[PDB]
Design a binder for this molecule. Structure first.
Ligand code: 9CR
Length: 237
């Protein structure tokens, strides 16, 4: 029924709004650390960065739990979905926080890093691809509810590997897909290609994430210690 789809759009939208501060509500602020030029790794910047990443992973687990039916999946499956889509979601998130004129990305506490800093923070040689994905996202002009539904679709995916009940996850995802097309089309009738464009972003995102995981391998050798436990949880996927 439509009321249910509408209900689903509102829930997800709020789940997302409540776990991911919009950019325009963020009290932006800066740092003067290695803004100068690129280097292998600025350890102060990496600490702040990984600390923010850890918190966003928890926020993501929170978001997932507010998605109808997630909590009804086996705990093994829930964990399986989180490990598999978490990096993808992190990517879509800072990328949706891109500011083209300043060429910066803003983290959840308002920390705004310029391209050199994101590099020094840890993205290293993957920075420009990240910024390139961010840029190629702007044309879509997705709103909060669309980014939330899309992240929900990235997460609830029955094609994951250790799924115990992949069929249950597919059925959970189904309404999310309906929700996104209905909403995307309603908000913009004149742009029929938005739904499929957004769906194709999922595949790109997954592409930048595998690269990001590979970036983590190298990163591990640059840091004078182990990466935060929640981040490692995510990387062991
Ligand atoms: C965590 C992490 C990585 C990527 C993080 C990304 C792609 C986004 C983080 C977004 C945050 C932290 C957003 C916010 O706070 O709003 C890379 C692949 C460099 C490897 C080391 C661990």
């Amino acid at each position: 029924l439509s009321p249910q789809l509408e209900e689903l759009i509102t829930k997800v939208s709020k789940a997302h709004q409540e776990t991911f501060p919009s950019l325009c509500q963020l009290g932006k602020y800066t740092t003067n650390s290695s803004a100068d030029h690129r280097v292998q790794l600025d350890l102060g910047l990496w600490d702040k960065f990984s600390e923010l990443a850890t918190k966003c992973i928890i926020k993501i687990v929170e978001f997932a739990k507010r998605l109808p039916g997630f909590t009804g999946l086996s705990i093994a499956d829930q964990i399986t979905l989180l490990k598999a889509a978490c990096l993808d979601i992190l990517m879509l998130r800072i990328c949706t926080r891109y500011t083209p004129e300043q060429d910066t990305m803003t983290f959840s506490d308002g920390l705004t890093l310029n391209r050199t800093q994101m590099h020094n923070a840890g993205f290293g040689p993957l920075t420009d691809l990240v910024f390139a994905f961010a840029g190629q996202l702007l044309p879509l002009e997705m709103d909060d509810t669309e980014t939330g539904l899309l992240s929900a679709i990235c997460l609830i995916c029955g094609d994951r590997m250790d799924l115990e009940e992949p069929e249950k996850v597919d059925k959970l995802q189904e309404p999310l897909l309906e929700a996104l097309r209905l909403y995307a089309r309603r908000r913009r009738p004149s742009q029929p290609y938005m739904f499929p464009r957004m769906l194709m972003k999922i595949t790109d995102l997954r592409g930048i994430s595998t690269k990001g995981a590979e970036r983590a391998i190298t990163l591990k050798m640059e840091i004078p210690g182990p990466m935060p436990p929640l981040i490692r949880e995510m990387l062991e996927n």
